[PDB]
Amino acid sequence: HMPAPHGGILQDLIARDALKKNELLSEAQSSDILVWNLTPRQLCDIELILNGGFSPLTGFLNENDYSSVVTDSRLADGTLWTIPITLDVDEAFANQIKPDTRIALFQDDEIPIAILTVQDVYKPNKTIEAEKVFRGDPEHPAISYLFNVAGDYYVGGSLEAIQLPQHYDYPGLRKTPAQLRLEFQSRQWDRVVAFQTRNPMHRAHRELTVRAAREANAKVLIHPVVGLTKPGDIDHHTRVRVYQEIIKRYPNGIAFLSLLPLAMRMSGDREAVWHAIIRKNYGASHFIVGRDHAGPGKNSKGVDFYGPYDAQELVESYKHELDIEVVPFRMVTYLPDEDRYAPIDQIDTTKTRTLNISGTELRRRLRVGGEIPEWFSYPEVVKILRESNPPRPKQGFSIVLGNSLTVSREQLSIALLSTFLQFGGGRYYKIFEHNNKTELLSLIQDFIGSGSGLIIPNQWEDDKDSVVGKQNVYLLDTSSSADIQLESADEPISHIVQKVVLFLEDNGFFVF
Amino acid sequence: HMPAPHGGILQDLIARDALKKNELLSEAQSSDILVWNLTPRQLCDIELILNGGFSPLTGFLNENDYSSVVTDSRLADGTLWTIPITLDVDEAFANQIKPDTRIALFQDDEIPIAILTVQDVYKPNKTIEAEKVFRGDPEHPAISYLFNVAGDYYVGGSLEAIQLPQHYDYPGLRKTPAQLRLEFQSRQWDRVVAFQTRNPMHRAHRELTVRAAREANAKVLIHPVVGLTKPGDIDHHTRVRVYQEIIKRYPNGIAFLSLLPLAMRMSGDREAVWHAIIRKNYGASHFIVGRDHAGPGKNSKGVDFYGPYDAQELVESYKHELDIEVVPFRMVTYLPDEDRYAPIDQIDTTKTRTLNISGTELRRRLRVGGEIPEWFSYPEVVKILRESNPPRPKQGFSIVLGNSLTVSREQLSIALLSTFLQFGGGRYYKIFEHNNKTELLSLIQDFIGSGSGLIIPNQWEDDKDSVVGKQNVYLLDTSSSADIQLESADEPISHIVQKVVLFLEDNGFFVF
Amino acid sequence: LRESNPPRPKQGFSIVLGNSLTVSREQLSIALLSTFLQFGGGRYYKIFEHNNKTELLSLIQDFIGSGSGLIIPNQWEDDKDSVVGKQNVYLLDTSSSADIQLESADEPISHIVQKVVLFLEDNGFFVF
Ligand code: NA
């Protein structure tokens, strides 16, 4: 039952180029070879290629495959493939390469990853890519990256592997497709259903998953993404701690945890098919496709990027060709009087109690510090989330003295500092003078991340608002754009202080 | 019974220079008048002088009173006075002043405090002062300050009150002698026993104090020092929270808390007499002098700066002259089977079970996060100290990659960071590059104070060790001076990471 | 009441291998036994062979009453269904009358085991 890789053969480049390692290593570490440092998304991508995770890929797509993928969701030879995997480069580097040029791809400017043999260098129409691949919405994460982070030139080419990107965390937890397939054989695991996730798992996830295992007669592979998920989500370290904990809530010998160095595009539809392909290469006969699978969410005008079922239908439409089975996850609700989750479909809310916790409410219960029902998520998991996302009483913040203020900045700072220290509780306070220095402005969010309260005497230049981070940063000024608005610019310091103290207290930072 | 100020009349200068405030304020901020920025200690002293708390002083001591104080612990006119209150200025400033010169004393370079009418300017023999006043031992906190911080030119002169130094914390809690006496009169309080302290109060302190009140038929005045105590101690904020909490464990209408802006010299012997005088001016008829009162402790060779009972004996020998009663606090111990503290005197240690917790064992339990008995310190009090002095798992730290390391600094830091993030526990981690900059080195301790873990890629110049701070800062090197010593200079990174992890785990920072 | 009528986690049960099964009864039993022992919690497990003996069939409900999990290799004769007691007794077979229904009679033992484990887990006997 274990699926053959996509395209019939596991492109384990690490294993195929084993004997030539030192040979490739040297060439890569020679001063005669042109060097290109891989960006974060590229590092995740290249790992899956050398890995065989992106079978049948063997390098970054050339214009021929890239175009076929963009317009037909297939490689030039017809193989289903929905996400363009290209090596984006800038004009400068582009002008130093031509077909057959040998490039060395490094990590952190010092670790030899692989040797790339160019065969194509083109300047893709990002308008068409954004439209045909990511549905053209300018706010879509992939399209934003496409235009502001991705180089404007793609470099098609074949790769020869030196070593997979270096990782120092979760060793042996990042099993390659070959290792996973071998692990499944050790356990005599025939049928395996894989679960995609870039989020923490709660009881519902544990139940829906065990259910899939039961109905599909397969074992469970919890395959969390730890490379790059949606921008601004929970760090993977925290998620992995949650996974390692929830894995213990499954009957013994039913589930296995393994991390996927994937860099998502949040391209729902196509991404789902891409996900099915990837797990297939990793050895899964079944793939769970959730509601709005890999969906960013809603845009500015509240419009959804993808339809709630777009992903499940797309994968379902290609499953026979992919030779995998799709396990659709229907929306579910909790029935208190039975202590069980059930498909919304079969519930008459008119004659049955139902409980549900939205992501917003959860984010709120972690901000406020309120209890989280044990039926929604396991105790151990909630504790883990509580540590990473502390309630406002344990959160850091920053109070910036507006430019409109005329009071003694030094005195107001001393006054605020002295005042905050009366409340105590654990938070460390500091009058922070940056002097419009980037080396110091870059530390603001670090102190806030540490729960520290910073009193900042002056504002920084607008051409640096990007160096800081708006999170928990409040402006004290007379302007209508301030978070703490003073009626005048020459108010008594005690007047000003009280306004700030009560503001913070109202926002939950101080508790008495 | 309420004593008369020391000298006969309370020198509440603020009250005698009221009808001259605007006038004096003008002169202060005038352009002609010479200005001097009051040092932190000078602020605490000047506040007590203008306050009346230092009666009969009416300004800083001149060479006449000073020498008298130094040799015979009295002022020129005989009046008892053991600690030399003088205005220490640098050479340069001394040469711009002559007798009759009027000076404007400012706080933080912008607040008019008082006008000083110079009477004397001299360069005291600090070798004699350190000897006759503080006993000579160079490691004595007062003698160290005397030479390394105090100016070399004392400026004697009278003072005219503008306003007492500004405080934004604990307003109305810092009552003046005039205010306290009024507060006492309002409560029909005649006999008052004052309790001095620069440390947290535990059940023992509550019991000894209540017992004192009972024996002397007096009310209790908890008079903590909030100015400057012993180098490196518990900030007054934490202590005030402790005081306000324990003050509630007294019978209603028995005790009263008030803060004393005193800058202690930790001059045990003399300072106790000085404290009795100060407390006398504040309206206290009784003063508690404890074992090694205002004592620095032990020097290098483990030799005590003062004798356990030197302070009690000295004040006791001047009490008749001071016109105040001395209340000696005898060493006590806890009796489990009787749930009460009793003097070590009447306790048959042989036939009686006794419990005691040293200041060191308390320090240890707070570092470890161990339990602290209820009989030793009130729960609310422990809570406060725990939050101010977090145990190792909640403590911050720094691992400085030594100079002898030949390994990649970029890769070792990255490996430490990703490894640390696996553990979780609320701590924020950061790779900190200072580039030998002071603006950055000064933040290291702020981060550690915030519970953060810093990974420092390079050591900082020797000429800047004084800018950092030893606390929880460990060096990873090969030298025998390293905190985490490495066998060789080019050990595998994984090998290094483990040595560091297990070191931090053995030291409490990590718990599993 | 909680002591006399324990919740499913502390309740005994019995899994009888249907007559339609073609798998190695000895192996399936060993497999189930070994598997149940991984979960633990307090329940005592036992492969129980009655050999259609009334003296032994009369003990089935006694073991269940003791919270024990019994793995029974074969079914007994219908003219004895009255000697046992249906309480917490589940049949593993292909027939539509079975409590745990297999799609085929020659399924992999690991296939069969998982079906039984998840059945019991769904019925509250195993808690993780
Ligand atoms: Na990137």
Q: For the residues of A410-453, what is the DSSP string, one character each?
A: HHHHHHHHHHHHHH-SS--EEE---TT-HHHHTTHHHHHHTT-E
Q: Counting beta carbons within 10 angstroms of the beta carbon of residue B418, is it exposed (0 to 12), middle (13 to 18) or buried (19 or more)? A: middle
Tell which A residues from 257 to 316 touch B, by Cβ distance under 8 Å.
none
Q: Which residues of B touch A437 (CB under 8 A)?
A: 439
Inter-residue contact A40 to A233 (CB < 8 Å): no
Helix, strand or coil for residue C34? Answer: helix
Tell which residue, A275, A5, A8, A13, has the closest CA to residue A157: A13
How large is the C-alpha radius of gyration of chain A? 26
How big is the CA angle at C115 (ends C110 and C120), to the nearest 5 degrees?
125
Using CA atoms, how far apart are residues B147 and B128, in angstroms rounded to an integer? 12
Question: Which alpha helices (DSSP H) does B53-158 contain, by range?
Answer: 63-72, 91-94, 126-132, 141-148
The residue annotated as part of the active site, out of B64, B101, B117, B199, is: B199
Determined by which method?
A: X-ray
CA atoms within 13 A on the CB side of B120: 18
By DSSP bridging, strand B255-257 and strand B219-224 are parallel
Inter-residue contact B79 to B7 (CB < 8 Å): yes
Using CA atoms, how far apart are residues B429 and B74, in angstroms rounded to an integer? 57
User: Does B512 touch chain A if contact means CB atoms closer than 8 Å?
Assistant: no
Residue B472, number of CB atoms within 10 A of its CB: 18
Using CA atoms, how far apart are residues B334 and B353, in angstroms rounded to an integer? 9
User: Does B185 touch chain A if contact means CB atoms closer than 8 Å?
Assistant: no
End-to-end CA distance of chain A: 61
Cα A261 to middle of ligand 1, angstroms: 13
Q: CA-CA-CA-CA torsion for B483, B486, B489, B490, nearest 10 degrees?
A: -130
Residue B237 vs residues A203, A394, A450, B240, C42: alpha-carbon distances, Å: 44, 19, 21, 5, 54
Q: Which residues of A touch B167 (CB under 8 A)?
A: 418
- Please report, as a single letter, which amino acid is at residue A321: E
The beta-carbon neighbor of A217 closest among C38, C114, C121 is C114
B291 is in an annotated binding site: yes
Inter-residue contact A426 to A394 (CB < 8 Å): yes
Please report the resolution in angstroms.
Answer: 2.3
DSSP run (H or E) holding A160: strand A153-161
3-state helix, strand, coil in chain C (%, to 5): 40, 15, 45
Domains in chain B with CATH codes:
3-190 (3.10.400.10), 191-390 (3.40.50.620), 391-512 (3.40.50.300)
Cα B309 to middle of ligand 1, angstroms: 70
Q: State the residue for tokens 């509550």.
A: B206
Cα B32 to middle of ligand 1, angstroms: 63
CA distance C104 to chain A (A): 13
The answer to whether A239 is a known catalytic residue is no
The beta-carbon neighbor of A249 closest among C38, C117, C128 is C128
Inter-residue contact A220 to A260 (CB < 8 Å): no
Structure tokens at B189: 């309080």
Q: Which residues of C touch A253 (CB under 8 A)?
A: 35, 38
The answer to whether B125 is a known catalytic residue is no
A407 Ramachandran zone, left/alpha/beta (phi>0; psi -120 to 50): beta
Q: Select from C111, C118, C123 the residue whose CB has the most chain A CBs within 10 Å, as the one to mutate to test that interface.
A: C118
Structure tokens at B354: 């006794």
Residue A294 vs residues A45, A82, B261: alpha-carbon distances, Å: 17, 13, 62
Report the interhelical angle of C109-122 vs C25-39 (nearest 10°).
40
Q: State the residue for tokens 């008030």.
A: B258
Do C118 and A210 count as a contact with CB atoms less than 8 A apart? yes
- Please report, as a single letter, which amino acid is at residue B43: L
Cα A41 to middle of ligand 1, angstroms: 4
B196 is in an annotated binding site: yes
Structure tokens at B305: 């700066």
Q: Counting beta carbons within 10 angstroms of the beta carbon of residue C47, is it exposed (0 to 12), middle (13 to 18) or buried (19 or more)? A: middle
Using CA atoms, how far apart are residues B137 and B305, in angstroms rounded to an integer? 7
End-to-end CA distance of chain C: 24
Using CA atoms, how far apart are residues B86 and A444, in angstroms rounded to an integer? 42
User: Does C115 touch chain A if contact means CB atoms closer than 8 Å?
Assistant: yes
Tell which residue, B324, B276, B266, has the closest CA to residue B133: B266
Residue B300, number of CB atoms within 10 A of its CB: 8
* Residue B283: φ, ψ to 5°: 100, 5
Residue B84 vs residues B70, B71, B152: alpha-carbon distances, Å: 7, 11, 14
Q: Residue A286's beta-bridge partner residues? A: A193, A325
Nearest residue on chain B to A493, alpha-carbon basis: B168
Using CA atoms, how far apart are residues B501 and A348, in angstroms rounded to an integer? 55
Inter-residue contact A166 to A111 (CB < 8 Å): yes
Using CA atoms, how far apart are residues A382 and A203, in angstroms rounded to an integer? 11
Structure tokens at A418: 């002295």
The answer to whether A350 is a known catalytic residue is no
User: Does C30 touch chain A if contact means CB atoms closer than 8 Å?
Assistant: no
By DSSP bridging, strand B102-107 and strand B111-122 are antiparallel
Structure tokens at A415: 């006054």
Using CA atoms, how far apart are residues B418 and B37, in angstroms rounded to an integer? 49
Do C117 and A251 count as a contact with CB atoms less than 8 A apart? yes
* Residue B344: φ, ψ to 5°: -55, -20
How big is the CA angle at A443 (ends A437 and A444), to the nearest 5 degrees?
95
User: Does A438 touch chain B if contact means CB atoms closer than 8 Å?
Assistant: no
End-to-end CA distance of chain B: 62
User: Does C34 touch chain A if contact means CB atoms closer than 8 Å?
Assistant: no
Sequence-distant (6+) residues with CB within 8 A of C75 are C16, C17, C18, C19, C91
CA distance C80 to chain A (A): 33
Q: Which residues of A235-255 are buried (b: 16+ CB within 10 A; e: fewer)?
A: ebbbbbbbbbbbbebbbebbb
Q: Counting beta carbons within 10 angstroms of the beta carbon of residue C46, is it exposed (0 to 12), middle (13 to 18) or buried (19 or more)? A: middle
Q: Which residues of A9-46 are buried (b: 16+ CB within 10 A; e: fewer)?
A: ebbbbbebbeeeeeebeebbeeeeeeebebbebbbbbb
Tell which residue, B476, B482, B504, has the closest CA to residue B420: B504
Do C118 and A253 count as a contact with CB atoms less than 8 A apart? no
Q: What 8-state DSSP symbol labels residue B150?
A: S
- Please report, as a single letter, which amino acid is at residue B412: L
Using CA atoms, how far apart are residues B280 and B272, in angstroms rounded to an integer? 12
Residue B164, number of CB atoms within 10 A of its CB: 21
Cα A30 to middle of ligand 1, angstroms: 26
Tell which residue, B116, B148, B142, has the closest CA to residue B35: B116
Q: Find how far residue A83's CA is from the centre of its chain.
A: 17
Inter-residue contact B250 to B220 (CB < 8 Å): yes
Using CA atoms, how far apart are residues A136 and A124, in angstroms rounded to an integer? 15
How big is the CA angle at B348 (ends B343 and B349), to the nearest 5 degrees?
90
Inter-residue contact A385 to B424 (CB < 8 Å): no
Q: Evaluate the CA torsion angle B162, B167, B172, B178 in order and state its sign.
A: negative
Cα A40 to middle of ligand 1, angstroms: 4
Structure tokens at B261: 């802006």
The residue annotated as part of the active site, out of A86, A176, A197, A229, is: A197
Do C118 and A214 count as a contact with CB atoms less than 8 A apart? yes
Chains C and B touch (3+ CB pairs under 8 A): no
CA distance A429 to chain B (A): 8
Q: Which residues of A touch B414 (CB under 8 A)?
A: 108, 168
Sequence-distant (6+) residues with CB within 8 A of A229 are A198, A236, A264
